[PDB]
Amino acid sequence: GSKPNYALKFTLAGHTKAVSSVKFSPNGEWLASSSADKLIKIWGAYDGKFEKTISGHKLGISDVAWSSDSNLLVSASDDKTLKIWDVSSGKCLKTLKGHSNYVFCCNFNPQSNLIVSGSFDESVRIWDVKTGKCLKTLPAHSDPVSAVHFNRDGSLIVSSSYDGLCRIWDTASGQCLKTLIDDDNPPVSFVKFSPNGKYILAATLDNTLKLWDYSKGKCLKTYTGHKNEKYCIFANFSVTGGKWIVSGSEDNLVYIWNLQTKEIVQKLQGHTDVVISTACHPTENIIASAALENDKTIKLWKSDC
């Protein structure tokens, strides 16, 4: 259909502080959640059945990411570390030390041999997953790094920052290929590549989402209507039904846009605080949405389209 009809299926509770992110396992069976409560909780994507807690970080966690094979997780913490976890045993495999301030964002490359991290120390770091050692430190930005993402073949890294810049990096050399957004500001609160790796989705703290052509360096689409002036809110490409942009908002709603028409096609109501994080299931029309400390719940939504 030409509009989704996402409806609340489950409300997942357990976190005792603000939830920071939610990500579906690539294999679709797990939802992972991180929180300011220093915990990672694993949930069944289809029944929301609480699976396990993963503990070890000494301070709050801002991001969590899956390896390609759904077996490993990596988390970014205010304790200035990342931890690589084995999901099955729930054990810390490695602790990545090097950042001199909070680690805000992380992702595996598709090969899942590397992890990219963004920090308040204004650097992007590339880590070897096998040895937990830092391979490279990029003096990426002049303010905290809000987001990092590898493209589909893992040859580029896109990073965003409160310095109002979005930069793309050559993984192998760590040299800057392009400075996509060269504004004094507003703060770039989030960036990721599109699934084909042609486009960058970029959020700015003037309630604006923009789809960029990486090669051309030009803004293709603008999405508006939501509120985003304070928080680094994740945005997603929904690709299992109709082609949507998904994002949280500071008005406690999940916003869904038609990618092409830039039209608002649904607003999800239920959260009682800022929706900080959203995730689109890899195979089913299901959304995970996560909220800050007044709510602390994860909501699973299902659509027919």
Ligand X SMILES: COC(=O)NCCCCc1ncc(CO)[nH]1
x/- track of binding to ligand X for residues 162-191 (CB under 6 A):
----------------------------x-
Any contact of residue 146 with ligand X (CB under 6 A)?
yes
Task: Give the burial class of 222: count Cβ atoms within 10 A of its Cβ; 0-12 exposed, 13-18 middle, 19 or more buried.
Answer: exposed
| Contact range with ligand X by CB under 6 A, out of 66-74, 80-88, 230-238, 258-266 | 230-238
Task: Pick the binder of ligand X from 62, 119, 285, 289 (CB under 6 A).
Answer: 62
Do residues 61 and 102 touch, judged by C-beta distance below 8 A?
no
Any contact of residue 108 with ligand X (CB under 6 A)?
no
Task: Pick the binder of ligand X from 24, 43, 85, 104 (CB under 6 A).
Answer: 104
Task: Pick the binder of ligand X from 37, 63, 163, 250 (CB under 6 A).
Answer: 63
Question: In terms of CB distance, is 147 or 268 closer to ligand X?
Answer: 147
Any contact of residue 257 with ligand X (CB under 6 A)?
no
Provide, rounded to whole angstroms, the least separation between the CB of residue 182 and ligand X: 20
- Residue 183 CA: distances (Å) to CA of 38, 139, 195: 34, 18, 26
Can you read off the two tokens belonging to residue 121?
């120390």
Any contact of residue 123 with ligand X (CB under 6 A)?
no
Do residues 37 and 51 touch, judged by C-beta distance below 8 A?
no
How far is the first Cα of the chain from the last one, in angstroms, to the nearest whole number? 5
Any contact of residue 21 with ligand X (CB under 6 A)?
yes
146-281-194-134 Cα dihedral, nearest 10 degrees: 50
Any contact of residue 276 with ligand X (CB under 6 A)?
yes
Question: In terms of CB distance, is 36 or 268 closer to ligand X?
Answer: 36
Any contact of residue 105 with ligand X (CB under 6 A)?
yes
d(CA 26, CA 267): 26
Question: In terms of CB distance, is 44 or 110 closer to ligand X?
Answer: 110
Provide, rounded to whole angstroms, the least separation between the CB of residue 47 and ligand X: 26
Any contact of residue 231 with ligand X (CB under 6 A)?
yes
Question: In terms of CB distance, is 223 or 231 closer to ligand X?
Answer: 231
Find all residues with CB under 8 Å of 33, minimum gap 6, and list them: 12, 15, 19, 21, 22, 40, 41, 42, 43, 64, 290, 298
Any contact of residue 266 with ligand X (CB under 6 A)?
no
Q: Which amino acid is at 115?
A: I
d(CA 232, CA 104): 10
Any contact of residue 35 with ligand X (CB under 6 A)?
no
| Contact range with ligand X by CB under 6 A, out of 4-12, 228-236, 249-257, 260-268 | 228-236
Question: In terms of CB distance, is 9 or 207 closer to ligand X?
Answer: 207
Any contact of residue 234 with ligand X (CB under 6 A)?
yes
Provide, rounded to whole angstroms, the least separation between the CB of residue 203 and ligand X: 8
Strands (E) in 87-172, as ranges, are: 91-96, 103-108, 114-119, 124-128, 134-138, 145-150, 156-161, 165-170
Find all residues with CB under 8 Å of 275, minimum gap 6, and list them: 233, 248, 249, 252, 253, 254, 289, 290, 291
d(CA 255, CA 252): 10
Task: Pick the binder of ligand X from 116, 232, 288, 291 (CB under 6 A).
Answer: 232
Binding positions for ligand X, rule: CB under 6 A: 20-21, 62-63, 104-105, 146-147, 190, 231-232, 234, 276
